[PDB]
Design a protein around this motif. Structure first.
Motif, PDB file in Angstrom:
ATOM      1  N   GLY A  57      17.159  81.139  38.898  1.00 37.31           N
ATOM      2  CA  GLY A  57      16.029  80.183  39.174  1.00 37.31           C
ATOM      3  C   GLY A  57      16.306  79.038  40.069  1.00 37.31           C
ATOM      4  N   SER A  58      16.570  78.016  39.637  1.00 37.96           N
ATOM      5  CA  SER A  58      16.780  76.932  40.378  1.00 37.96           C
ATOM      6  C   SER A  58      15.393  76.334  41.084  1.00 37.96           C
ATOM      7  N   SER A  59      14.958  77.422  41.875  1.00 34.68           N
ATOM      8  CA  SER A  59      13.632  76.995  42.563  1.00 34.68           C
ATOM      9  C   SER A  59      12.715  76.349  41.731  1.00 34.68           C
ATOM     10  N   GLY A  60      12.532  75.029  42.304  1.00 41.70           N
ATOM     11  CA  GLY A  60      11.295  74.269  41.541  1.00 41.70           C
ATOM     12  C   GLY A  60      11.866  73.963  39.949  1.00 41.70           C
ATOM     13  N   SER A  61      11.533  72.944  39.482  1.00 38.99           N
ATOM     14  CA  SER A  61      11.868  72.368  38.164  1.00 38.99           C
ATOM     15  C   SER A  61      11.254  73.205  37.105  1.00 38.99           C
ATOM     16  N   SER A  62       9.876  73.199  37.123  1.00 39.11           N
ATOM     17  CA  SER A  62       9.019  74.181  36.303  1.00 39.11           C
ATOM     18  C   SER A  62       9.608  73.871  34.788  1.00 39.11           C
ATOM     19  N   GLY A  63       8.760  74.577  33.790  1.00 45.46           N
ATOM     20  CA  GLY A  63       9.154  74.155  32.444  1.00 45.46           C
ATOM     21  C   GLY A  63      10.587  74.576  32.084  1.00 45.46           C
ATOM     22  N   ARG A  64      10.859  74.777  30.776  1.00 47.95           N
ATOM     23  CA  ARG A  64      11.937  75.438  30.311  1.00 47.95           C
ATOM     24  C   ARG A  64      12.348  76.758  30.540  1.00 47.95           C
ATOM     25  N   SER A  65      11.364  77.353  31.234  1.00 47.21           N
ATOM     26  CA  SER A  65      11.460  78.808  31.480  1.00 47.21           C
ATOM     27  C   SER A  65      10.693  79.103  32.744  1.00 47.21           C
ATOM     28  N   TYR A  66      10.364  80.430  33.052  1.00 48.60           N
ATOM     29  CA  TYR A  66       9.975  81.119  34.055  1.00 48.60           C
ATOM     30  C   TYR A  66       8.438  81.515  33.647  1.00 48.60           C
ATOM     31  N   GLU A  67       7.802  81.663  34.698  1.00 46.02           N
ATOM     32  CA  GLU A  67       6.558  82.073  34.975  1.00 46.02           C
ATOM     33  C   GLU A  67       5.707  82.638  36.217  1.00 46.02           C
ATOM     34  N   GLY A  68       5.137  83.751  36.131  1.00 37.03           N
ATOM     35  CA  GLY A  68       4.639  84.409  37.438  1.00 37.03           C
ATOM     36  C   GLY A  68       3.969  85.598  37.040  1.00 37.03           C
ATOM     37  N   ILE A  69       2.913  85.928  38.203  1.00 39.76           N
ATOM     38  CA  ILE A  69       1.955  86.802  37.948  1.00 39.76           C
ATOM     39  C   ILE A  69       2.802  88.372  37.541  1.00 39.76           C
ATOM     40  N   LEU A  70       2.289  89.031  36.626  1.00 40.19           N
ATOM     41  CA  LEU A  70       2.942  90.259  36.288  1.00 40.19           C
ATOM     42  C   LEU A  70       1.805  91.365  35.752  1.00 40.19           C
ATOM     43  N   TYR A  71       1.832  92.499  36.508  1.00 47.33           N
ATOM     44  CA  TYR A  71       0.812  93.494  36.191  1.00 47.33           C
ATOM     45  C   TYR A  71       1.388  94.427  35.216  1.00 47.33           C
ATOM     46  N   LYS A  72       0.400  95.350  34.840  1.00 46.20           N
ATOM     47  CA  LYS A  72       0.748  96.374  33.665  1.00 46.20           C
ATOM     48  C   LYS A  72      -0.014  97.844  34.057  1.00 46.20           C
ATOM     49  N   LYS A  73       0.870  98.717  34.165  1.00 46.07           N
ATOM     50  CA  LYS A  73       0.119 100.100  34.272  1.00 46.07           C
ATOM     51  C   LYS A  73      -1.243  99.988  33.640  1.00 46.07           C
ATOM     52  N   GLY A  74      -2.022 100.959  34.167  1.00 47.19           N
ATOM     53  CA  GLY A  74      -3.345 101.144  33.603  1.00 47.19           C
ATOM     54  C   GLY A  74      -3.431 101.992  32.835  1.00 47.19           C
ATOM     55  N   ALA A  75      -2.984 103.228  33.043  1.00 41.64           N
ATOM     56  CA  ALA A  75      -3.088 104.472  32.214  1.00 41.64           C
ATOM     57  C   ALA A  75      -4.375 104.714  31.697  1.00 41.64           C
ATOM     58  N   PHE A  76      -5.498 104.023  32.486  1.00 42.78           N
ATOM     59  CA  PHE A  76      -6.899 104.322  32.328  1.00 42.78           C
ATOM     60  C   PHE A  76      -7.859 104.506  33.546  1.00 42.78           C
ATOM     61  N   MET A  77      -9.084 104.769  33.170  1.00 38.12           N
ATOM     62  CA  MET A  77      -9.948 104.862  34.475  1.00 38.12           C
ATOM     63  C   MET A  77      -9.375 103.834  35.289  1.00 38.12           C
ATOM     64  N   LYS A  78      -9.638 102.423  35.091  1.00 37.53           N
ATOM     65  CA  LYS A  78      -9.231 101.285  35.709  1.00 37.53           C
ATOM     66  C   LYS A  78      -7.868 101.362  36.147  1.00 37.53           C
ATOM     67  N   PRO A  79      -7.558 100.807  37.099  1.00 34.95           N
ATOM     68  CA  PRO A  79      -6.317 100.314  37.935  1.00 34.95           C
ATOM     69  C   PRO A  79      -5.474  99.635  37.108  1.00 34.95           C
ATOM     70  N   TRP A  80      -4.226  99.048  37.453  1.00 38.22           N
ATOM     71  CA  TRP A  80      -3.419  98.104  36.710  1.00 38.22           C
ATOM     72  C   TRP A  80      -4.025  97.006  36.586  1.00 38.22           C
ATOM     73  N   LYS A  81      -3.700  96.192  35.524  1.00 35.07           N
ATOM     74  CA  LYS A  81      -4.082  94.979  35.156  1.00 35.07           C
ATOM     75  C   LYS A  81      -3.407  93.484  35.637  1.00 35.07           C
ATOM     76  N   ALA A  82      -3.746  92.774  36.275  1.00 38.99           N
ATOM     77  CA  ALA A  82      -3.023  91.611  36.548  1.00 38.99           C
ATOM     78  C   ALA A  82      -3.501  90.484  35.360  1.00 38.99           C
ATOM     79  N   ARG A  83      -2.083  90.216  34.883  1.00 38.48           N
ATOM     80  CA  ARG A  83      -1.991  89.217  33.935  1.00 38.48           C
ATOM     81  C   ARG A  83      -0.955  88.124  34.114  1.00 38.48           C
ATOM     82  N   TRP A  84      -1.157  87.155  33.317  1.00 37.71           N
ATOM     83  CA  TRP A  84      -0.337  85.973  33.621  1.00 37.71           C
ATOM     84  C   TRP A  84       0.895  86.011  32.470  1.00 37.71           C
ATOM     85  N   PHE A  85       2.092  86.469  32.801  1.00 37.84           N
ATOM     86  CA  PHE A  85       3.218  86.607  31.926  1.00 37.84           C
ATOM     87  C   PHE A  85       3.998  85.201  31.836  1.00 37.84           C
ATOM     88  N   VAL A  86       4.723  85.245  30.716  1.00 36.06           N
ATOM     89  CA  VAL A  86       5.866  84.075  30.516  1.00 36.06           C
ATOM     90  C   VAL A  86       7.171  84.664  30.356  1.00 36.06           C
TER      91      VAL A  86
END
Length: 117
Positions: free
Chosen positions: A1-30
């Motif tokens: 990590g190092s980059s930026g202070s940020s909380g006591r952990s990391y956080e960034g955008i993370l998508y998940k396979k769709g497996a359905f009519m619609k494409p992958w879904k973009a969610r905010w993971f932690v």
């Protein structure tokens, strides 16, 4: 990590396979390193966390390839599959590197094994 202070952990955008009519879904993971869990909210800072992935239950991860449904933003050298006790998970960051960091992170907290060495 190092980059930026940020909380006591990391956080960034993370998508998940769709497996359905619609494409992958973009969610905010932690990527909690202190809790060693995966918390993703439907929306950035939602009432409460919806779903958890005990990193301690992760067998490992591997850089997969971009399939159908995935975003046309990130590259192939980013997508990384997460293997756990429950089942396999498909995740990918919004960058080739940003992804590598996600892996290293998750990989930095896989399963407890033999110490000293």
């Amino acid at each position: 990590g190092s980059s930026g202070s940020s909380g006591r952990s990391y956080e960034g955008i993370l998508y998940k396979k769709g497996a359905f009519m619609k494409p992958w879904k973009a969610r905010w993971f932690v990527l909690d390193k202190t809790k060693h869990q995966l918390r993703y909210y439907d929306h950035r800072m939602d009432t409460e966390c919806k779903g958890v992935i005990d990193l301690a239950e992760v067998e490992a991860v591997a850089p997969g390839t971009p399939t159908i449904g995935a975003p046309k933003t990130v590259d192939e050298k980013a997508f990384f599959d997460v293997k756990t006790t429950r089942r396999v998970y498909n995740f990918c960051a919004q960058d080739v590197p940003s992804a590598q960091q996600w892996v290293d992170r998750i990989q930095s907290c896989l399963s407890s094994g033999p110490s000293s060495g």
